[PDB]
Design a protein around this ligand. Structure first.
Ligand code: HEM
Ligand code: HEM
Ligand SMILES: Fc1cccc(C[C@@H]2C[C@H]2NCCc2ccnc(-n3ccnc3)n2)c1
Ligand SMILES: Fc1cccc(C[C@@H]2C[C@H]2NCCc2ccnc(-n3ccnc3)n2)c1
Ligand SMILES: C[C@H](O)[C@H](O)[C@H]1CNc2nc(N)[nH]c(=O)c2N1
Ligand SMILES: C[C@H](O)[C@H](O)[C@H]1CNc2nc(N)[nH]c(=O)c2N1
Ligand SMILES: [Zn+2]
Lengths: 411, 407
């Protein structure tokens, strides 16, 4: 079966065959679409076909499918599975796997870069202190004094589900959030609960508006341990505006390295519960979501007051005006400090080209329109006009429950 | 099978049971989501009639009544007898209002119960259709105080006697292909503007020429009609800061009136059922004006604002986009023509959703369409999970007449 997607602005039509290789369920049925829903211990039984499927993919990609090297590897994995109930990926397989999970991440607009991913193999790590060392090295490598480099660090895979490695932070670098007794919030409201855990675990909080959270690291199913990232490793950018000089006095800054640290990486049936990865920011992540979400820093009003906009009626579009100037500020500040960033116009244009290339070379490109379209100025980006098909391929990045909800405390 | 939707900004969780009633398919499967795809007999008829009458009679606290049973009986006999049936006026109105209520792509549904339904099932000719459409336009326009309306023409019989309005909207601007290679007016309507000429229209080849109506009654060839200019409320677009904005020479019409959809009620098919509401500002300023394949004025505006169009990262497009949408809202409000901004409209829709979940067990909504085409995440609907499914009565797309018309 073939499926066509149309770009309604260019009339370019593409044909998808790749969705046939999809196994995992979407959440949708023939009777209901769940496209806007945010989120709609493994036996040797199911493990070998998952291994085989992956190794089939891997050997095809290296033009060695059906080779003696291919067949020997399958054999070796099978024997290892029934003997040990799991298996170990070769370094080459791991790298392929990590790159392809990124390639398959339908919610990521940055995928044109998928083949350039630095993979750090941390499967020999055994303790939290060891994890901290690997993470520091990742941050330094990825940061690269502002010339950001995509990277992922992969810790040992799940075994029985009782010895999981987990980074308890949602991102490696994030600002603390503090609930005040008067009901207000200081810092990042998104991080209030995690901030409380850190404090409870013995973090001495500065209690400011932009306090970099400590790392909370779990190795081998043990209780997590606190580590402060060396401040010299945390690149931050003061936010100013090219035209408005009062903008700097808002006191805004942001960190340069966006690094997701709470997802699960699945490769060939193996589950890597700690696999922090990092790229670089698309400007709207900070300027629209981090700063302007009502549930985050929520600075729209203060900005709009300082711009002296008509704030009595929404039909003045003061919010839209303030939102644009903030995003201009974010982009300006990063570029001026020579920290890698991409605007949503550039990002989405590149994604369209990536997607077209993927359709031709790969037979498809799974994409989640709801997440790909930027949270401002949607229809003046080419992705808005692009039909997209969403389906799940493996290797993949998946959500997993927050570890504080599942952790068995040792004491 | 009982589904919850979360708002992520408010943590409000709603439980949906209404989707269970859905009958038609979405295009999605367990293995693939098609949420962003724009378009994914006697024995067929009676269960459809039955489903509709059941909900109609349920809605008036008379489910399981003799009148219910009698009506079901009467319709059943009429179908067995005539291979179709006729809706009572009360059912027709109920059906029209509920088709709007069920329109998962319409953000304006909080108004759904206040629809004026014009019954034009007695219409037999294109001149008759023209008259009904003028009356609709005059009524809906209401000198600028817009009122929601639908006019319903006779239902499909054998597919040879279809009533069709050929225009996609009652009121639209012509589009002409220059020899210069470019496009004069609205590029979306080049193909239709040609068919007007092929059938006899005399285009004044301008930029904002109100298109004539092409009306098809009872399967006949369509005829041309000029809507009385006095009935077409238009708004000159000016900005409340930039006095150069007027010289762009932009204007738009006040009445948004979809005329090419199919209304399906109780299995019956109404191929001609133009309806109108009033504009949300972004439909005009973002889509009509700034789409590349439409009037595409972003560059010209940016020039006049003297922005740095050297780099995309100056966000000159975004900046201009906002100003254009300010002008649109300003111009309509200044001329006292009903318009709603995307903030007000989406705020209204969240309230509607909560009402629907409370009083109906759910609200089908297409997030891809409900989230406005600018400033997505600063409107409440962006953070609102939505379930999309098809309920009937419904408005459906249908093929363009000029591909199907047996001339
Ligand atoms: C290199 C530049 C990159 C850019 C510009 C970029 C851009 C983005 C953006 C804008 C999102 C949406 C985030 C949100 O709204 O929550 C996203 C999500 C995502 N990205 Fe990237 N990304 C990049 C690198 C990477 C890398 C290196 C990986 C993995 C190796 C990756 C994997 C993912 C995944 C799995 C998601 C979905 C997260 C979720 O569902 O919560 N991306 N990306
Ligand atoms: C009264 C104020 C109304 C507002 C503010 C409103 C708003 C909107 C908007 C913004 C859209 C998206 C249009 C697009 O992007 O192409 C839409 C679509 C739609 N509306 Fe409304 N509307 C209103 C009235 C109505 C009425 C009176 C009806 C029917 C009786 C209706 C039925 C529909 C349908 C079926 C669609 C989907 C169009 C499509 O799929 O192409 N709406 N509405
Ligand atoms: F399914 C969900 C339920 C609740 C919240 C949510 C928000 C998603 C976590 C946010 N997605 C990651 C955001 C992020 C932060 C930093 N860097 C990056 N990043 C880096 C490379 N690619 C993305 N993404 C989803
Ligand atoms: F599937 C598609 C293929 C090509 C174009 C497309 C756009 C849909 C026509 C636009 N939907 C109606 C737009 C419109 C215009 C005027 N008024 C209203 N309107 C009035 C009340 N509610 C909506 N909608 C879809
Ligand atoms: C309900 C809705 O799915 C949710 O708000 C989504 C919308 N699209 C998004 N798109 C991106 N990139 N990131 C997000 O967090 C979201 N949130
Ligand atoms: C490809 C995508 O489905 C298409 O561009 C949609 C996106 N969302 C939309 N939303 C609305 N309201 N109207 C539209 O025409 C569209 N177009
Ligand atoms: Zn779907």
């Amino acid at each position: 079966r073939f499926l066509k997607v149309k770009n309604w602005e260019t009339d370019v039509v593409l044909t998808d065959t790749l969705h046939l290789k999809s196994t995992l369920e979407t959440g949708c049925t023939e009777h209901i679409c769940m496209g806007s829903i945010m989120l709609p211990v493994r036996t040797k039984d199911q493990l070998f076909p998952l291994a085989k499927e992956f190794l089939d993919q891997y050997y095809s990609s290296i033009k060695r499918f059906g080779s003696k090297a291919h067949m020997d590897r399958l054999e070796e994995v099978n024997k290892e599975i029934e003997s040990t109930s799991t298996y170990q990926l070769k370094d080459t397989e791991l790298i392929y796997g990590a790159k392809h999970a990124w390639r398959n991440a339908s919610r990521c607009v940055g995928r044109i870069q998928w083949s350039k991913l630095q993979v750090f193999d941390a499967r020999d790590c055994t303790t939290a202190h060891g994890m901290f060392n690997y993470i520091c090295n990742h941050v330094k490598y990825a940061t690269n004094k502002g010339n950001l480099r995509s990277a992922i660090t992969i810790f040992p895979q799940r075994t029985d589900g009782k010895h999981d490695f987990r980074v308890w932070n949602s991102q490696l670098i994030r600002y603390a959030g503090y609930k005040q007794p008067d009901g207000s919030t200081l810092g990042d409201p998104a991080n209030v609960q995690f901030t409380e855990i850190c404090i409870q675990q013995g973090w001495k909080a500065p209690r400011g508006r932009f306090d970099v959270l400590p790392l909370l690291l779990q190795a081998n199913g043990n209780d997590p341990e606190l580590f402060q990232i060396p401040p010299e490793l945390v690149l931050e950018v003061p936010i100013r505006h090219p035209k408005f000089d009062w903008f700097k006095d808002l006191g805004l800054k942001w960190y340069g390295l966006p690094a997701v640290s709470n997802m699960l990486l699945e490769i060939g049936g193996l589950e890597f519960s700690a696999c922090p990865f990092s790229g670089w920011y698309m400007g709207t992540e900070i300027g629209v979501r981090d700063y302007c979400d009502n549930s985050r820093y929520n600075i729209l009003e203060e900005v709009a007051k300082k711009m002296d906009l008509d704030m009595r009626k929404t039909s003045s579009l003061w919010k839209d005006q303030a939102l644009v100037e903030i995003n201009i500020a974010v982009l300006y500040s990063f570029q001026s400090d020579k920290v890698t960033i991409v605007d949503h116009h550039s990002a989405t244009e590149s994604f369209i080209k990536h997607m077209e290339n993927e359709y031709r070379c790969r037979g498809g490109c799974p994409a989640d329109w709801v997440w790909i379209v930027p949270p401002m100025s949607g229809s003046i980006t080419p992705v808005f006009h692009q039909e997209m098909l969403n389906y799940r391929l493996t290797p993949s990045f998946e959500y997993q429950p927050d570890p504080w909800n599942t952790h068995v405390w040792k004491g």
